[model samples]
Target: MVSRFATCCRALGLTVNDRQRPADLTAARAGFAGLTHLAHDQCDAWIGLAAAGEVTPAVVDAVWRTVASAGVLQREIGLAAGELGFTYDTGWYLQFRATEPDDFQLAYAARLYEAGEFGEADGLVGEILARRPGWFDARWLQVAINHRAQRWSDVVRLLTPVVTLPSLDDVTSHAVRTALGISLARLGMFAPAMSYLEDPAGPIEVAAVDGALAKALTLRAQGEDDEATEVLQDLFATHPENTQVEQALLDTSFGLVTTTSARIEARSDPWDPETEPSEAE
Candidate 1:
């Protein structure tokens, strides 16, 4: 007779091969029962067994309920869910108005962005937004992309409304404020631009560094040398190793406080050694 566990496995579209024992099926079924009862830890105990084969639509549906409804995941279950495409709908993920796009594309674009391939990343983001305009994460990514490309007008236009919205995630709110501030500064609206960096609405610490950096530059442009220097000093104390902060200080100081020289070198061989040999050698 087919066991109850085997029957539940069949419901999830997983085949009961000869290698899988009735005992194993019993455990899996018990896990499923735990999952239905919202016993997340119990469900976690058997997630590994479910991940042995290609996850089916039924499996996706079943696991998503536990995952989405649960407050968190066991580390192992979370990693396996990612491997099986049963992840990505975590509660913090932004909602979308348009139909979902391919997961592969979104992930790939994000990788490209991290690698500094702004052009390629922006292209993919454009494609994604064309289909899913209300995909907040992708739209948020485009704001960074445009900023990198020095499309200041686009940054201003895109982020203006975004910053006005009362409800935004910490990261999004920070990015919008920084991007808007920098873009306005670039456009020579120094006074208006200073507002974004000086008087941020959201959690200030989340974007404090960027805001301070932009505010310093804007203040310098407005001939507020004492104020600008003070802002840079505070930033340097907090972000000691930040090159941008270092450079901005130099820009206004006009070589008075030159502690270190900055260099821009391209990699001749992409996989070079981290620390170059000493000149004496």
Candidate 2:
């Protein structure tokens, strides 16, 4: 449907199309001022992210705070308007309002995200990032949205490059790096995951959640990759502490016929080339 905002833009001799929409508050304020002279500073509040170079995940958070409620409130008004026979266009407010170009786009995606609409949220950010390669927040939003649905590979790939993007504020840099680190851990690329967390700018602390992954990564970094993998995959039934968790685990770990369960009692360290034959029996 053609939006009243589009009609207003056209009325003012401005082109109105997918490519020609209001990308920043200037165009939006210009449209509103031309139509009704009621624009204010709140209209321009999201201007901080207008430039790709100026865009950072941190500042976009502030812009999100400013525009988040407006879109929801205005969208709500439209729903009410539509339910009655009036059909007022209050919902079209999002169309004319803007901050950075991505500001509105990602803001819309967030609503989808909160409502458990993962498919469309990821899809929308997919299109946004395709056009604006440096759209920092949209890319981050893709990570956030995809991760929610447990799309592990999807998140890991998005973040590897994301960790190196230009002008990331310090906290944002660390945040993305931590996300990349843990995503790698979840993907079983524990060595590289440890590399990220060990970097100076990488992690303040990755412990509160997924704490065991760090220790597992440490074990892998010590040249015990598969050992670490089984340790974590087995939920770290510890060996040394003798809480006897592994004993508990091993007892139930048998999956074959009872006759071959004899070998189960001979459990030992997993075979490794490095430790194979010190004396060459």
Candidate 3:
């Protein structure tokens, strides 16, 4: 308990003032020692308790960020960062929250993942996941790693189990649906992916355009060029001035002509290399 409190103390960049007692951290004396060992999910029970004290917002924010479920992307934290002139990806999954006592390693893992050093980051998180099978944050970190890697199938597999959680908050639930929808879309399961993506206020709603592009690409890869063109055309019609949609339409159109031309050239050309010298001898 002392070590965990000290770890939080260190992470917060505060002095070990349990007795020296700082004014801003008025609540920390009681809260840090009494509340330091609570599990991440158990935060709501104490959020108001700690929040009611004379502590500064940073202390409250620090505690919340280090304890809330990453799934929610807490509006408090969002506005905090937003007002500070920055933004975070839904993929970043709300930082600082952790189930492990030694969260420094996970913090390091997050940095490594952001640095594109996925193999080492994954190995590190994987070690924690093995030790604490009950730790959802570790698994969520893995999801973030796979999400960044664009390993759509792996994310699909990794996140499916989140559905079995005892309960999910509104934001987290919506984000889950959005991520699962995106995963399914990228994996060519349009029917299922579309269902989740279409949920009102789902995280996927922000990501709607790419879902359509994934559909179009999958259709084209499945030898349905006209269908793919039709999809891109609809996308442009819906988001008429969108450069991404326009870009995709042009690329699909160019590929369509190339496909048709290449097919004819392959079958009917007489002077092509393969027809001469005893079948390209």
Candidate 4:
């Protein structure tokens, strides 16, 4: 009990010295020693109790509530609580009401977004944007939610302006770029889509694989069969298990389709009046 409490104390930036250790230990125990139940408002106190291995239903609730907006410090304690078997809740820590309004709203929207409550998340994000039009994080979240809802046009429209922001962090910028490429491809704007899809650096490695496929498909659409075949062959070697890559490779292999108009004449017969008279003749 003392050890866990000591660890949690460190997480909260509190140190337990040897002289103060005895009283701290007693306080930690007495905080929830006889309590058979816990409540939401006692969330912070419950954290100490949780560290001492006295976790109850109330402790789990408190831990999740803290996890929502506890920031870096509370997150450390919340993780410790999670290690002790508290159920994880991906919601904003409304208990941290002292947080800045816009920041708190962003956190709340993110939690809702993660929880798959897109409509409400969208509403909150829209509110944040109206208040602070220059807030890129909120704009990014709105784009993410739109992507999740598969509103491709909205994804393209929303991301277009935001992608140009020089202040965008690497990860968010990558996501917006990839989503833009995908949205363009979905809209059949293959020429413009090629630029975004060919880079292969955004989101996950699978995004690169997805982009490769889009790029190859666009190449084929533009009468570049050999280039498309080459791309699919390379992608097949790397993403053997990706269904889209595999299907495209198979299509290229069997000549079931041509990505370009290069070889069709070789496989067709030209009119040869000397060899055979036409029906009209």
Q: What are the clash counts of all predictions, listed in order?
A: 0, 0, 0, 3
- For candidate 4, what is the total of clashing residue pairs? 3
Tens digit of lDDT per residue, candidate 3, span 155-248? 6787788855777766566556666766776655766765664432434444456656655665665677897888889878978888877887
lDDT string for model 4 (198-248, tens) is 775554565667677877877777778899889898998977777878888
lDDT of 1: 0.53
| TM value for model 4 | 0.55
Model 1 ranges off by over 4 Å: 1-103, 113-119, 200-206, 250-281
Candidate with better lDDT, 1 vs 4? 4
Looking at model 4, the pairs that clash are: 68-93, 69-93, 225-260
| lDDT of candidate model 3 versus the reference | 0.52
Model 1, range 108-146, lDDT digits (tens) per residue? Answer: 454455456656777888897998897666776677655
Q: After superposition, how far is residue 170 of candidate 4 from its true place, in Å?
A: 4.0
Lowest lDDT 10-residue stretch of candidate 2 = 83-92
Top candidate when judged by TM-score against the true structure = 4
Predicted candidate 2 versus true structure: per-residue lDDT over 1-281, tens digit per residue:
12543443333333435334434545544444443223222322223222212233333444444553333322322322111110111111111223343555675566566567767777878898789878666677777775554455666778777777788776566667666666666556667767765542323333312334444455555666665566555544433344433443344332111111122222242111222222222
Q: What is the lDDT of residue 66 in candidate 3?
A: 51
Best by lDDT: 4
Error of model 3, residue 104, in angstroms: 3.1
